[PDB]
Amino acid sequence: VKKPHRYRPGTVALREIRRYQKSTELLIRKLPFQRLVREIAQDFKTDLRFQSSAVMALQEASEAYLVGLFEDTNLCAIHAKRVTIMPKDIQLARRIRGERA
Amino acid sequence: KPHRYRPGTVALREIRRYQKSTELLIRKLPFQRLVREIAQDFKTDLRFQSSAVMALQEASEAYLVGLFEDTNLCAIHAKRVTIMPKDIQLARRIRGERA
Amino acid sequence: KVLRDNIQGITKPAIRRLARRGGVKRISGLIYEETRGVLKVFLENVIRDAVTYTEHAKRKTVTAMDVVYALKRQGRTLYGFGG
Amino acid sequence: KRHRKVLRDNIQGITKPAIRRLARRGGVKRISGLIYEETRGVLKVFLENVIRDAVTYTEHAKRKTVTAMDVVYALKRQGRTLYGFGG
Amino acid sequence: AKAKTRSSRAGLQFPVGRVHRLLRKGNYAERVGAGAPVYLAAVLEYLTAEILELAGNAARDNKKTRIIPRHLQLAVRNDEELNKLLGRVTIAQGGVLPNIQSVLLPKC
Amino acid sequence: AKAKTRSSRAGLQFPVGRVHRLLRKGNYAERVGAGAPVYLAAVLEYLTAEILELAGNAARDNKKTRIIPRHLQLAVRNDEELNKLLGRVTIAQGGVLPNIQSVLLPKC
Amino acid sequence: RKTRKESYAIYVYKVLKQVHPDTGISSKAMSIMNSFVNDVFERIAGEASRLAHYNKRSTITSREIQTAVRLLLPGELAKHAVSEGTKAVTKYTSAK
Amino acid sequence: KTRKESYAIYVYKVLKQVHPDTGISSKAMSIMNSFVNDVFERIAGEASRLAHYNKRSTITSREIQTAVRLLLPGELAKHAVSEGTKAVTKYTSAK
DNA sequence: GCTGCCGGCGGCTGGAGAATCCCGGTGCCGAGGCCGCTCAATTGGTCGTAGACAGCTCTAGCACCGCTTAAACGCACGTACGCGCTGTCCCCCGCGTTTAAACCGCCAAGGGGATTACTCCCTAGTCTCCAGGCACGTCTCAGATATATACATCCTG
DNA sequence: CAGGATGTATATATCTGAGACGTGCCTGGAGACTAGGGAGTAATCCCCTTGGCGGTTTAAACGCGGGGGACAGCGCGTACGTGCGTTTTAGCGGTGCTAGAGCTGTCTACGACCAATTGAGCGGCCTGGGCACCGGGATTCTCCAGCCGCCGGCAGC
């Protein structure tokens, strides 16, 4: 019987790359990120509250920063005659970016 | 018969020696003429202060020292010791002057 | 499986889709945890300034003004939330 | 021959030895015969950004002489502030 | 006698008195001139008009009669000079410009 | 009578009156509080003293009794807590630290 | 119910009616434009005041902002903006 | 004519009170002057910006303190706020 | 020789998920009229930054020759580049399914925010004193050599 | 596989010399002593919007299985960057030698300052109608996948 239909490895990845690049939706879920930000901000001020607008703005700024960092990481990865992004790649991209050292 | 250092011994000596120095890297009248030549394009009939020229030279020197640091790091990441144009291009792309 | 760290709320599919929006087609297996670390580092960096701004206001809330001001101070301005 | 001394072909004056020493300070072990032009290009680009701002400062000052104030001042504007010139 | 807004006599739809008050109370200088707010209003008007036209063109491209922040991001990032001006700016609900590295593409 | 300076009253070696005048004339606010120049002088004094003991330690290491910008860079770029504040600024006649990548080193 | 806030909504709408007369603008886009124009205004005014302090002057005239925009905006926007400012100030002075 | 202004003597006194047997060169001295001026301008701008955000027309020690907290990293910020606080209490004790 | 045979070669149509597009009505809410309030224009007078004019002088721009120093060419070579072979094994892509995101609704309430009287912390003016910049002025202690050796490097037996 | 000879560096004794460190001098800035006047501060109170609660409901994340292609080590052709020797070419430099315009002082004036009215621009506050959205469904759009004539060896004879 016919082998079940399968895309080749590395094509649906490009399809969803195209899908996400044209979409402005929030790639990170509301509740896990809000929980993370509260769990990481409780140390600065115990029992601190946030506004909904403030938390969505913070989340979207984090997404923009991380997506730019990832695009620079991919640029460095393709520069190093490879396609797989490696930990050394992300560290190098951060360290050129001037945020690490 | 003659004594020749290995291809990199004198290179390493230069790295370990010149890094400890702090004077200006490159001859002065070259930057003086170059700065006047570029400033001519923006506006003619200018008048430069010596301290301004020293500041420009030191700023450019530091900029390219940092740049060569970044390209050396990129090259050492690329599993190589030499440096190539794509290292400079990558370093300037991530830094953001050209983006 | 109900007691988990809130940093792990940033799940592998979510970071994968963030990278896909970035424009990378292949990701290695050791990217997720270190990206989580750098993401949390950026979070603490921005929230430190945000909470400092809030304490200046003598208020217990963190309105959008403090977070946009903190982001602008860090070097990443943001539009649409007041200004 | 009183004024108007137009100069050309001065970027080349940075010799290959010179870039070699600059990169040795940067900490490289080897080099290629291909950087010596793009490093000159990044040089020129850097200087046009600096002295463009410097001459705008000077023109705002209703004066022709470019003091070190203007160059360090535009340098601080570019986010690359310099210490040691009256800043 | 009869009064008239300074924006009408300045040829700009942007306010003049408002920018004058903003300069006054913004703690910039001890004093500001009379034509300084007019100049600032004019340059702000030009900037808004340019960015709005660039966003509306993308809106008509996406067959929308209303400007969405995604259109603003597309207009900002598409224009190279505008991208250089707003380089370190994060937009609200804008996403990123669609670009894929050609190396990652398949052979054919 | 009996005029005494604010720097002595605050036990500081930086001019509190001068800092207050600079704040007054710097177009920062319509009014300036009394303790703000004191706080500013104190923090500048701490920072200066901090980098100064780093520079003095570097000079004593380099067996010299005079402070030069080489010592200033050698002191600033060794401790990352000061680097995070002065990582963007460069100083005149500075140079860099003697760092060589391990791969560039010979086999043994 | 009180403390009427202040914003550039009507002005951006009026500009839109003269660039794309049959095009609407979303509320989020309106907030983005208001924030952007406020940020640009703040940057320009800060540059103007900073130069006024730099050349030891205590007044901000059209020249200061002209040099600021020539200093801030790169490319064609600089020349177009200075031309717009010049024509606006000449128009304002002509009929005072 | 036209007396100039510098932070020379103050850094001089600071180094003499922490290093009785160490001098400073003129160029490094101007480097210190630029350091002091740059940090002072940064703090003053941050304080003015904070006061404008909080609808405050005055700058007290509190805005300076918060700028110190948010601008310098960690240990420097905490040490600097400690010194600033003790100095301001000492000044307010006998004003 | 002159037949069989044997594997690749890529060219094509064909089976097959996904992406796209139009209708269709349903929501949702940018767009538009009203009121007054809050601020902006407007006369009416002031006074003080910033322009002009008259110089003064420190500083900016030049060429010149000994000279040496580093720049420049070319030279052999052993290395590091770039790449082919190969061989994991580690990411990928579906699949079932477990789970937590969200959205829904309704509260409870700590707190954000608009008014109030004032006070007291700051500002504005005069007079008074002095800390600090400047012009010198040194005597240094800071540099700068040529010298004598360690050293580690490239080989040899 | 262990030492020897060598271009590198290391101290280091005088020379030797620009410049940190005082030191008067004076002066504009700092500071002390009064009106005075609103900016912020508790006090007050009124929404409000943020935390918290618990059903659906459902897309989504997680563990797992198969496999395929990306990556990294090994080996090799090569080209070329480097150390080095031999020129040679421009920089260094102390020197007058020249003027250029920043710079300071002064007179002036005009443009912003601020005040007391006065009226409208617009922020709000509804409000009906116009635009974005969702679902079904038809339409393309690529993606991958095997069939087979053509092509090139592959063994005999």
Numbering used by the authors:
A (entry chain I): 35 to 135
B (entry chain O): 37 to 135
C (entry chain J): 20 to 102
D (entry chain Q): 16 to 102
E (entry chain R), F (entry chain K): 12 to 119
G (entry chain S): 27 to 122
H (entry chain M): 28 to 122
Wording from the paper:
Polycomb repressive complex 2 (PRC2) trimethylates histone H3 on K27 (H3K27me3) leading to gene silencing that is essential for embryonic development and maintenance of cell identity. The interaction of PRC2 with substrate nucleosomes involves mainly two structural elements within the catalytic subunit EZH2, the bridge helix and the CXC domain. A central mechanism of PRC2 activation is the recognition of PRC2-trimethylated lysine peptides by its EED subunit, resulting in conformational changes within PRC2 that lead to the allosteric activation of the complex. We discovered that H3K4me3-containing and H3K36me3-containing nucleosomes inhibit PRC2 using two distinct mechanisms because of the differences in their positions along the histone H3 tail.
To investigate the molecular basis for the inhibition of PRC2 by chromatin marked with H3K36me3, we sought to determine structures of PRC2 bound to modified nucleosome substrates using a PRC2 complex containing AEBP2 and a construct of JARID2 that included the allosterically activating K116me3 segment (referred to as PRC2AJ1–450). Analysis of the cryo-EM data of PRC2AJ1–450 bound to the H3K36me3-modified nucleosome resolved two distinct states at 3.1-Å and 3.5-Å resolution, respectively. In the first state, the H3 tail can be seen binding to EZH2 and entering the EZH2 active site (referred to as ‘tail-engaged’), while, in the second state, density for the H3 tail appears absent (referred to as ‘tail-disengaged’). Further comparison of the tail-engaged and tail-disengaged PRC2AJ1–450–H3K36me3 states revealed that the tail-disengaged complex is rotated with respect to the nucleosome interface by approximately 12°. Of notice, in the tail-engaged state, R504 interacts with the backbone of K36 in the histone H3 tail and R497 forms an electrostatic interaction with the backbone of the nucleosomal DNA. In addition, the CXC domain in the tail-disengaged state now contacts the major groove of the nucleosome DNA at superhelical location (SHL) 6.5 (while it contacts SHL 7 in the tail-engaged state). On the other hand, when the histone H3 tail is bound, as captured in the tail-engaged state, the H3K36me3 modification does not affect the binding of JARID2 to the EED regulatory site and the allosteric communication between the EED and EZH2 core subunits is not disrupted. Our structural data show that the trimethylation of H3K36 interferes with these interactions, resulting in the loss of a well-defined register for PRC2–nucleosome interactions that is required for effective H3 tail engagement and methylation. In summary, our results are consistent with a mechanism in which the histone H3K36me3 modification reduces productive engagement of the histone H3 tail with PRC2 and promotes dynamic interactions with chromatin that are incompatible with the trimethylation of histone H3K27 by PRC2 at actively transcribed gene bodies rich in this modification.
